[PDB]
C-alpha cells in the first residue's frame, strides 16, 4: 500500500 | 506472521510520516520515551527525536477502491492536505460522505473532511484518504457477512 509523495 | 509499519509526527510541521528505521532511543526521569527516527522519504539531515507515546503509531492505510465503506463520519483518518507550497498528510475528521456508483477508475465517493490542527475544511477523493489500520475490523466484518 503506497503513499503519496509529501512535499514539505 | 503479519508485519507491523510506523508512522511518526513531526515537530516541524505537525504532519505524518512513514518511517523507514528507528536509530536510538533515550529516557527521562519525568517518562515519556523518546525514539531516533529516520524517515522514509528523507535522509540523516532530517532524522528526528520522536516521543514515543505521542507521536509514533501503526501506519495508516491508503484505501483500497473497495474500502469507501470502511470510511465513516465521525472516523479520524490521515489525509493528504495538498496545497500551493506544501502537500503533506494531516490528521482529520470526516464530516460527510457522499458515496457514488463506482466505474472503470474505480471508488467515486467525496468526503467532507475537517483537519484537526487547523479547522479547515476539504472535500477530497478517496485517493487522498489513509484509513487507521482498526478498520480492517470493519473490513472483515464485511467479509463475514459474504456467500459461502
Ligand atoms: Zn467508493
Redesign the interface.
Known amino acids: 500500500?503506497?503513499?503519496?509523495?509529501?512535499?514539505? | 506472521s503479519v508485519s507491523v509499519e510506523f508512522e511518526a509526527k513531526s515537530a516541524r510541521d505537525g504532519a505524518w510520516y512513514d518511517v523507514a528505521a528507528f536509530l536510538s532511543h533515550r529516557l527521562f526521569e519525568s517518562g515519556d520515551p523518546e525514539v531516533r527516527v529516520r524517515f522514509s522519504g528523507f535522509g540523516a539531515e532530517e532524522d528526528e527525536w520522536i516521543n514515543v507515546r505521542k507521536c509514533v503509531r501503526q501506519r495508516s492505510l491508503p484505501c483500497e477502491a473497495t474500502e469507501c465503506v470502511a470510511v465513516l463520519p465521525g472516523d479520524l483518518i490521515l489525509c493528504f492536505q495538498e496545497g500551493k507550497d506544501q502537500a503533506l498528510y494531516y490528521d482529520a475528521h470526516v464530516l460527510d460522505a457522499q458515496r457514488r456508483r463506482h466505474d472503470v477508475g474505480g471508488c467515486r465517493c467525496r468526503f467532507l473532511v475537517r483537519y484537526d490542527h487547523d479547522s479547515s475544511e476539504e472535500i477530497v477523493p478517496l485517493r487522498k484518504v489513509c484509513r487507521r489500520p482498526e478498520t480492517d475490523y470493519r473490513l472483515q466484518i464485511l467479509h463475514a457477512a459474504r456467500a459461502a
Request: aromatic residues 0%; charged residues 50%; proline residues 0%.
Open positions: 500500500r503506497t503513499k503519496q509523495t509529501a512535499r514539505k
